[PDB]
Write a protein that binds this ligand. Structure first.
Ligand SMILES: [Ca+2]
Ligand SMILES: [Ca+2]
Ligand SMILES: [Ca+2]
Ligand SMILES: [Ca+2]
Ligand SMILES: [Ca+2]
Ligand SMILES: [Ca+2]
Lengths: 209, 209
């Protein structure tokens, strides 16, 4: 039956995952071993099996973003030296931890907005990614916010950002490129729908006629 | 055979966990049910089992910090209405996500320190806890930092904090009650050994004669 193990586990190692058993203990003594990537081919020895007990262990932390599944085969051999069964497939699923912060595709996004743009007009878009597991978890679920605006004139909150899409809009009036030529917004992306790990970048908006 | 499920999974629900079998299905219909806290006692219906297929399922997201291990029992009953097995114990392990910030044990810690205190002199100790899995993960592994000091004289950094223990110490010279009787530090606790979710509190230090 399929086995799962979280990434990034603390020691001590090794750690038991499951005990393999041949119904062919009828033959007395069986010796167990495993093959596959993560066993006897690279990366070698991430999993091992106790020869006599059949205990299948993990020997170090896993990393879902590097390898997310392993396919091993367990072998069972008599003391006279013959395989007593065909190799049995084992499937190991690495489950995700929130160990990647969202990462903005650029450090500085640049856009422009026209004087007299209607309140509610889209201006530009910022984008972050998150390497964590977006299928099974919220570890990659990104909310966008604005942290600050420089300058704070003529109003402190000239703009808003859609917390899902990262589209920035102008939401009030009084753009004037001859007094305040640009706006520099610090934007944040945070996973767990905004409550999780975060980073920031900058969006710089040029005011046009 | 031992089963696990991450907390806080996305749907859709329900999700298959494992299929229970009796080798008594040779004879005819077996009907499957489960008892225990999480099944028929509180919280009720978190796990169900398909009567015919014996597919054990989970019906909603789990919260490890509510219940981290469930002990259920599977029952198997002939279509004529007799138990064809002893009830069989099922252990479900709920594996952790980092969804709890550290939390200081109080919002304001107090300490005092002689103005004639040598650099390296312990002043006080702040303390946080984290409800996540401190045994298997780093999701509750807290690192303490200082974020701010007030006032910022005679130096901005009159104190340092032990990353691991939260012990605060005098780091430099010039403690003087009459000029500055009171320092107010903002301290922070963050999990994943400092890289993770974070909270802040305050330490208020009095300079004594
Ligand atoms: Ca990882
Ligand atoms: Ca991850
Ligand atoms: Ca993430
Ligand atoms: Ca939880
Ligand atoms: Ca935590
Ligand atoms: Ca948790």
């Amino acid at each position: 039956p399929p086995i799962s193990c979280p990434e990034n586990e603390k020691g001590p190692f090794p750690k038991n995952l499951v005990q393999i058993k041949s119904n062919k203990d009828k033959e007395g003594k069986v010796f167990y071993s495993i093959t596959g990537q993560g066993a006897d081919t690279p990366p070698v020895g991430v999993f091992i099996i106790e020869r006599e007990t059949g205990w299948l262990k993990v020997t170090e932390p896993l990393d879902r973003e590097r390898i997310a599944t392993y396919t091993l085969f367990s072998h069972a051999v008599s003391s006279n030296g013959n395989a007593v069964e065909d190799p049995m497939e084992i499937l190991i699923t690495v489950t995700d931890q929130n160990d990647n912060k969202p990462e903005f595709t650029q450090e500085v996004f640049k856009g422009s907005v026209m004087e007299g743009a209607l309140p509610g007009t889209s201006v530009m878009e910022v984008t972050a990614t998150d390497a964590d597991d977006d299928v099974n978890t919220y570890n990659a679920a990104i909310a966008y916010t604005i942290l600050s605006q420089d300058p704070e004139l003529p109003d402190k909150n000239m703009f808003t950002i859609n917390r899902n899409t990262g589209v920035i809009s102008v939401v009030t009036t009084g753009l004037d490129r001859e007094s305040f030529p640009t706006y520099t917004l610090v934007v944040q992306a945070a996973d767990l729908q905004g409550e999780g790990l975060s980073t920031t970048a900058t969006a710089v908006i040029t005011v046009t006629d």
